[PDB]
Amino acid sequence: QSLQTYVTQQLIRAAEIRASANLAATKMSECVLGQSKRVDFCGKGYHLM
Amino acid sequence: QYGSFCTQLNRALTGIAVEQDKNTQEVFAQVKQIYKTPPIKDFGGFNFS
């Protein structure tokens, strides 16, 4: 009952990290490899690089 | 006799609760200042009242 609780928490945690890894790859695409015009997505201000 | 489950359940619900204010902060508190309209409604014929 202790491992099923730990593993259920790691599966939920890893989904929060997944959402953050998907967001990090989405910034590294649009925000580093480009110049995204999406307001406040890429620092406060107008985004240069 | 069942160990840390008690605390693990209290900690987990506290983790959710303390996040609901991170959600409410990041959705609404994006604006640095309390901006206000002038009292007179000279908005081109558009009626935001």
From Swiss-Prot, chain B:
Domain of life per record: Viruses
UniProt effect for mutating D42H: In strain: B.1.1.318
Glycosylation sites: N47
Function noted in UniProt: Precursor of the fusion protein processed in the biosynthesis of the S protein and the formation of virus particle. Mediates fusion of the virion and cellular membranes by functioning as a class I viral fusion protein. Contains two viral fusion peptides that are unmasked after cleavage. The S2/S2' cleavage occurs during virus entry at the cell membrane by host TMPRSS2 or during endocytosis by host CSTL.
Protein name in UniProt: Spike protein S2
Species this protein is from: Severe acute respiratory syndrome coronavirus 2 (2019-nCoV)
Lineage start: Viruses, Riboviria, Orthornavirae, Pisuviricota, Pisoniviricetes
Full-length numbering of the shown residues: 755 to 803 of 1273
